[PDB]
Every structure is written in structure tokens, then in C-alpha cells.
Amino acid sequence: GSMDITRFKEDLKAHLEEKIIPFWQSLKDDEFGGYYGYMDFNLNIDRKAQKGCILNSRILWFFSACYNVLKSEKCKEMAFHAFEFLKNKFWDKEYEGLFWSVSHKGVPVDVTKHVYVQAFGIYGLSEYYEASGDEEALHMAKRLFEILETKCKRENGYTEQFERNWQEKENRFLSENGVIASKTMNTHLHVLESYTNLYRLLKLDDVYEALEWIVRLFVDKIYKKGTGHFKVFCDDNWNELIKAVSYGFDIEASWLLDQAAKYLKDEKLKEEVEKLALEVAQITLKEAFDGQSLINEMIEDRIDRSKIWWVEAETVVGFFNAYQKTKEEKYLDAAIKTWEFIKEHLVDRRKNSEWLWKVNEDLEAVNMPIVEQWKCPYHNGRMCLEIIKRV
Numbered sequence: 211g212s213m214d215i216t217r218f219k220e221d222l223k224a225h226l227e228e229k230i231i232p233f234w235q236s237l238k239d240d241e242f243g244g245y246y247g248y249m250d251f252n253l254n255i256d257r258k259a260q261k262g263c264i265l266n267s268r269i270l271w272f273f274s275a276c277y278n279v280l281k282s283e284k285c286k287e288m289a290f291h292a293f294e295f296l297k298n299k300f301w302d303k304e305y306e307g308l309f310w311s312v313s314h315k316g317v318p319v320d321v322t323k324h325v326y327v328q329a330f331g332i333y334g335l336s337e338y339y340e341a342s343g344d345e346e347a348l349h350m351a352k353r354l355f356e357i358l359e360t361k362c363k364r365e366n367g368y369t370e371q372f373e374r375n376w377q378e379k380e381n382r383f384l385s386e387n388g389v390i391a392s393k394t395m396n397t398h399l400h401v402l403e404s405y406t407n408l409y410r411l412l413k414l415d416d417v418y419e420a421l422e423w424i425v426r427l428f429v430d431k432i433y434k435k436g437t438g439h440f441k442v443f444c445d446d447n448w449n450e451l452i453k454a455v456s457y458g459f460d461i462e463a464s465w466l467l468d469q470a471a472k473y474l475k476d477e478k479l480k481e482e483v484e485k486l487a488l489e490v491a492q493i494t495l496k497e498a499f500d501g502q503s504l505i506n507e508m509i510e511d512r513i514d515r516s517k518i519w520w521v522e523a524e525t526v527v528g529f530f531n532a533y534q535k536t537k538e539e540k541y542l543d544a545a546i547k548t549w550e551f552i553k554e555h556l557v558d559r560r561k562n563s564e565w566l567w568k569v570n571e572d573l574e575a576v577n578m579p580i581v582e583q584w585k586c587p588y589h590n591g592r593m594c595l596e597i598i599k600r601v
């Protein structure tokens with residue numbers, strides 16, 4: 211820590227409190243429950259938009275973590291509102307687990323069960339349990355864990371997509387050329403993340419074993435040894451469908467794996483994981499940090515130098531984490547300058563807005579929604595919360 215790091219945290223706390231929190235408070239749907247599901251680039255909310263379960267759970271996580279860190283009573287009420295919509299509309303009373311999507315009124319639109327959705331449910335419900343003490347939220351998280359472990363897990367990871375009644379299906383995520391990816395970095399990273407939070411709160415043996423198991427899967431199958439990159443979209447045997455590098459996923463997995471490593475009881479694996487996380491952060495700085503911000507991805511030989519909101523948020527956390535473990539100032543410098551880029555190019559200058567989805571290579575804003583099933587307060591809100599907690 212120093213004077214720059216302290217002012218850094220203060221700046222992120224003010225941004226979260228004066229920009230992020232009140233923006234997402236304005237998305238609260240008091241007519242039907244939950245949160246409005248879409249806001250276009252011109253800041254027009256579509257109150258009738260379908261509501262994604264992942265978005266609701268990320269909002270639940272965000273407001274819960276805000277209460278847990280800042281003790282804001284309004285944030286706890288905002289989390290309650292999202293918990294109520296999860297409980298009443300996304301949770302399947304008959305077969306259990308969480309639907310994929312519902313209408314703005316809460317009518318089930320896509321009742322299939324995806325591990326990606328269940329994991330985010332565990333993440334938000336456990337966070338909300340810490341904030342509220344609600345035993346029903348704790349029950350749902352535990353049941354989601356047992357379902358994942360007893361119905362969805364396989365020898366080499368999770369089957370990712372299921373019918374409503376948990377009969378397995380082929381996956382819904384597709385490679386760039388339309389081949390089904392039976393194994394995705396996406397799903398398994400958020401299983402890891404949700405299990406870390408669950409174990410941190412519960413400290414249960416069964417949960418520890420599943421956490422260690424998923425950490426090992428990342429070390430043994432998903433990580434591309436010696437490259438600093440993880441596989442993104444795979445067949446059922448963790449063979450890449452395409453040579454693809456997501457620098458955003460790399461740097462996020464870097465600090466998430468580092469985080470889980472703190473709980474590991476096998477000291478060899480723990481040293482392994484901490485070395486992996488730093489190898490990834492080192493490669494990421496060298497290959498994807500342009501001196502200003504992080505580029506997006508490389509698909510085969512095509513580089514996308516767009517600046518995506520969640521990539522830069524995770525870059526700030528990942529590089530700050532790398533700085534904390536090494537004390538090498540190149541990482542701290544990179545994290546702060548990425549924050550300075552976000553402030554100048556991704557924080558919307560129009561009133562009553564939040565963060566732009568992306569700017570292109572030429573730093574031009576691109577027409578993309580401000581709120582969508584995949585654009586949430588989770589990444590950028592967690593960026594602020596992490597720095598607040600770490601400094």
C-alpha cells in the first residue's frame with residue numbers, strides 16, 4: 211500500500227456509491243418484481259423485456275456484497291427484492307433449480323436447467339445469506355450444490371445443459387463455427403467461483419472436496435500448460451474446438467484461482483495454483499495489455515482489440531491481485547491505468563447511465579445496450595468491491 215493505492219480505493223468507492231449503486235437501483239421493477247431486463251444504447255428501458263436468471267442472480271450478488279462490505283441498508287433491501295424474484299419466479303418448485311429465463315411478469319420462458327445458471331444462483335444466494343441470514347436462501351444454495359454434484363457432475367467436469375427435469379441435453383453454447391461446445395471455460399469458471407463463496411461461508415467437508423476437485427480440473431484439463439491461457443470452448447474431452455484465447459477469461463480466472471487457493475488444504479496443489487495464477491497474469495500483461503487497457507481475444511490469428519467493459523473490470527482486479535502477491539509495480543501501474551481508461555472511455559458521459567458495453571479499437575463508442583441479459587453490475591461492481599476489501 212501507498213498514497214496512490216489509497217486514493218485509488220477512495221476513487222473506486224465513490225464511483226460505486228455515486229454511479230454504480232444508484233444506476234442499478236433505478237432498474238428495480240416494482241410492478242412485477244425483480245429488475246427490468248433491458249436498456250438500449252439510448253438509455254430507453256424496456257420494462258417488458260424478458261428477464262434472464264443470470265442477470266437477476268448477479269444483481270442479487272451485487273447488492274448483497276454491497277451490504278456485506280458497505281453496510282448500506284438500501285442495498286440490502288435491493289438484494290431482498292432480487293431474492294424475492296428468484297424465490298418466486300426463477301426457482302422451479304417442482305423439479306428444483308433455477309429456470310433460464312422468465313417473462314417480465316415471471317412466466318417461465320425457458321425452463322431448461324444450465325449449470326452456468328445454477329452456479330450464479332449459488333454465488334448470489336450464498337452472498338445474500340451472509341447479508342440476511344435467510345435460511346431459505348441457504349437451503350436453495352445447498353440444494354443447488356447437491357443437484358450439481360449428484361445429477362450434473364461427470365468424470366471430467368460438468369455436463370452443462372439439462373431439460374427442466376434434469377435429463378441431460380447437448381449444450382446450448384456454440385463455437386464460432388456453430389459446433390456445440392460440450393465443455394466451456396464459462397460454465398466451469400463460475401462453478402469454481404460459486405463453490406469458493408459457498409465454502410468460505412459454510413466450511414463444509416463435502417463443499418471443500420468439490421472445491422478442490424474443480425480447482426484440480428482447471429490445473430489438469432482447462433489450463434494450457436506453459437501458455438498462460440485457458441481453453442475456452444471444448445468438446446466433451448476438453449479438446450479445443452478452436453484455437454481461441456479470451457484475455458478477459460484468463461485474467462479473471464487468474465485471481466479467482468488465486469482466491470480459491472487460500473482455502474486449499476493440499477499444500478502442493480496450493481503452490482501449483484498460486485504459480486499458475488501468476489504465470490497467467492504475467493502472460494496477460496505481456497500479450498494483452500497495450501499500455502492503456504486490455505484487448506479482448508484472439509481467435510486463431512485474428513486479434514480483437516476492442517475494449518469490453520467486463521474485460522477491463524477483471525483486468526483491474528487481476529493485475530491488482532498480481533501486484534499484491536509479487537509487489538511488482540508493473541502490475542499496479544497496469545491496473546490503475548486500466549481504471550483510468552475505463553473512466554475516460556467506458557464510463558458513459560450521458561446522464562442517468564452507467565458503463566458502455568464497449569468501445570472499438572479506435573475508442574469509438576459502439577451501439578450496444580447498457581443493460582442486457584449479459585450486462586450486469588457484477589463484473590464492474592465486483593471490481594470496486596474487491597479493491598475496497600483488499601486495500
Ligand SMILES: O=C[C@@H](O)[C@@H](O)[C@H](O)[C@H](O)CO
Pocket residue numbers: 396520584585
Ligand atoms: O457471452 C458472454 C458472456 O456470457 C460471458 O462470457 C462474459 O464473460 C461476461 O460474463 C458477460 O456477462
Ligand SMILES: OC[C@H]1O[C@@H](O)[C@@H](O)[C@@H](O)[C@@H]1O
Pocket residue numbers: 368369370371378379380381392393445446
Ligand atoms: O458431446 C456431446 C455430449 O456432451 C456431454 O457433455 C453431454 O451434453 C451429452 O448429453 C452429449 O451427448
